[PDB]
């Protein structure tokens, strides 16, 4: 009864791979050989943001491109102001084992989460910061959470399931199961209609926020996926994995496009993020620094060395003015 | 230069101050321990007194120890253990009585030792259930030779210190487990960490003192290495 279904799944997979091969007329690398090179994109640390007393595990730029919140194991969830290097808020975290943080698109809210398996929501704009909500129910640790709005939050978890939560109601409205390994990162689409997520099974799956089940699943990576982010166009995304390879998948093509890796690089990626145009694919490796890529050329076009310890988080502003990288050296650097 | 700008700068100053006092009050004279092992082990019963992720804060001599016990996550622990890359030690606990799971205990030990992020993290190896091991070996129904063929050519170490009451077969078995763990401990050591064996029982009360002395040695060796004295 199981062998027959396994054979059916095998033949559906064969059909899918045959369709992908048929659609693979030509690769972007082959179609772009005539493109002028971008050149060396050098970036300097504009405003170093020191003050965290321990390792920094995550960060999220604000939608105003000014207020970035950082989560660290020291127990703080500081909300920095990159323009003035002014810590607007310093939220004390009940569980020091934070692993992710997010900033609401409006700005009125900020979230955290980690090995406590609870997504804690905070009123960053309060009349009196208190613990606004204590969303619980996941069995595994929280890897990455994002805000659709002030009331809906999508949190990835280490129990292989990422769920959608109604903040005020207090329980998972929709649960997106399907991953066979721990989900490690999240990425919301520019239209906020779909979200992809790489997991600990080297696969990134596309979910519809409302429909509630996986739409497309991409399996091109070799090891655990640690980071993910849509292309600005919204029809593609890039994924960083422990195999030291950034991989550009396009949703419409339903298959790989490019591979961003070299024999020189051995450390895996902990954080990737597209630029405003999408021509740049800034990624953060374990080798104490970040590398700037070229999505069209698949050729590395700069580095972001300057961090003492491993780089854990990396994000670009919505207007793409500057990128902030948070590393284990307890320092946030904004690289414009 | 504006009033709002001055208020923001003052707020940043007080936030930095508050972070300062909070960090100096927390991180001073405290040490964090990650407690690992299996269910059948004395995972939650190592330190009998002074009792998602669990916690156990105990003090020996004016020094604070936070002993974390992750016991809520999934089986795949290759990811969430990256957070404990700064702890002073890892309190590994082994169920010496049951030899069947002892091989995967060795596998866990070798994976912890050779992990890139757990590389500079010493392990305070607590060989537990010593009394149960004693009754098992005295009964002799299960022979450790079946689960490990290297027991035949093994010999008890000369430096071994027999307890006042112990059968030589008990001593040979327990030190064979100890040496099987130190094989992995000494295979790939960058000198940045060391395994500290400590035969313990569920009724032992000196586990806190053992962890205190072992962490003292760990920090002393780290300081010597930092100051080039080692």
């Amino acid at each position: 009864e199981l062998d027959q279904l396994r054979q059916e799944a095998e033949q559906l997979k064969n059909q899918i791979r045959d369709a992908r091969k048929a659609c693979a007329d030509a690769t972007l690398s082959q179609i772009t050989n005539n493109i002028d090179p971008v050149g060396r994109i050098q970036m300097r640390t504009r405003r170093t943001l020191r003050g965290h007393l321990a390792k920094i595990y995550a960060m999220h730029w604000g939608t105003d491109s000014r207020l970035l919140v950082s989560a660290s194991q020291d127990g703080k969830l500081i909300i920095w102001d990159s323009y003035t290097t002014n810590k607007v808020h310093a939220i004390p975290l009940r569980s020091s084992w934070v692993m992710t943080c997010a900033y609401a698109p409006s700005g009125n809210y900020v979230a955290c989460g980690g090995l406590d398996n609870i997504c804690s929501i905070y009123n960053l704009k309060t009349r009196e910061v208190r613990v606004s909500r204590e969303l619980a129910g996941h069995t595994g640790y929280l890897s990455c959470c994002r805000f659709l709005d002030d009331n809906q939050i999508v949190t990835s978890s280490g129990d292989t399931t990422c769920a959608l939560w109604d903040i005020e109601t207090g329980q998972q409205t929709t649960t997106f199961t399907g991953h066979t390994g721990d989900v490690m990162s999240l990425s919301l689409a520019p239209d906020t209609r779909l979200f992809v997520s790489g997991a600990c099974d080297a696969s990134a799956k596309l979910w519809d926020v409302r429909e509630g089940m996986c739409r497309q699943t991409f399996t091109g990576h070799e090891s655990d996926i640690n980071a993910i982010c849509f292309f600005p166009n919204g029809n593609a995304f890039a994924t960083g994995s422990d195999d030291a390879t950034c991989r550009l998948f396009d949703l419409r093509a339903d298959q790989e496009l490019m591979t961003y890796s070299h024999d020189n690089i051995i450390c895996g990626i902990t954080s990737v993020s597209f630029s405003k145009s999408g021509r740049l694919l800034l990624a953060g490796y374990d080798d104490f620094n970040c590398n700037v890529w070229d999505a069209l050329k698949a050729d590395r076009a700069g580095v972001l060395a300057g961090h003492d310890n491993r780089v854990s988080c990396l994000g670009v502003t919505d207007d793409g003015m500057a990128v902030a990288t948070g590393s284990w050296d307890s320092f946030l650097k904004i690289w414009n | 230069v504006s009033a709002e700008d001055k208020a923001a700068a003052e707020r940043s100053k007080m936030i930095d101050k508050n972070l300062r006092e909070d960090g100096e009050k927390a991180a001073a004279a405290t040490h964090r321990l990650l407690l690992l092992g299996a269910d059948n082990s004395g995972k939650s019963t190592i330190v009998k007194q002074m009792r998602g992720i669990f916690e156990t804060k105990f003090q020996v001599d004016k020094v604070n120890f936070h002993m974390f016990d992750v016991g809520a996550q999934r089986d795949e622990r290759r990811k969430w253990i990256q957070c404990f890359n700064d702890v002073t030690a890892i309190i590994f606990v082994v169920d010496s009585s049951d030899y069947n799971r002892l091989q995967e205990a060795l596998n866990d030990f070798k994976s912890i030792w050779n992990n890139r992020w757990l590389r500079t993290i010493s392990v305070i190896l607590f060989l537990n259930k010593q009394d149960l091991l004693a009754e098992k070996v005295l009964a002799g129904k299960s022979k450790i030779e079946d689960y490990f063929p290297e027991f035949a050519r093994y010999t008890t170490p000369e430096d071994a210190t027999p307890e006042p009451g112990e059968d030589p077969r008990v001593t040979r078995a327990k030190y064979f487990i100890r040496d099987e763990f130190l094989r992995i401990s000494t295979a790939s050591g960058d000198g940045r960490h060391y395994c500290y064996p400590h035969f313990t029982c569920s009724v032992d009360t000196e586990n806190a003192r053992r962890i205190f002395n072992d962490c003292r040695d760990i920090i002393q060796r780290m300081h010597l290495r930092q100051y080039e004295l080692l």
Partner: nanobody
Amino acid sequence: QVQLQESGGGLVQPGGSLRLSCAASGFTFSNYKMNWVRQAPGKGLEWVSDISQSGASISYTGSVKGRFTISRDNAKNTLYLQMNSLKPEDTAVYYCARCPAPFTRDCFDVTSTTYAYRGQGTQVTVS
């Protein structure tokens, strides 16, 4: 896709030999430390054999030390485990599960119940 399809095994009387092989695709096989974890019916998954990235460091679990032998062919992308002089207790399903990270020696989580990069399995029956 990282897929591990196993081949070989079957039925054999005690003391027999059945070489196990599994084709590996979707990854650079020569960069991942390999394993041969098994699962007996009614018992949890048991790690049996091991190899190095280049086949230098080789380790075996005590219950089958010497009787079994692992070997890796990078060009063939196949992991070979030679079990000679089988025992009735060897009856189990065998997985040639690799371990997630490349360029590393620590295979941290392989014998987990829902490991992502493990093979389909070969049921070897010894009676």
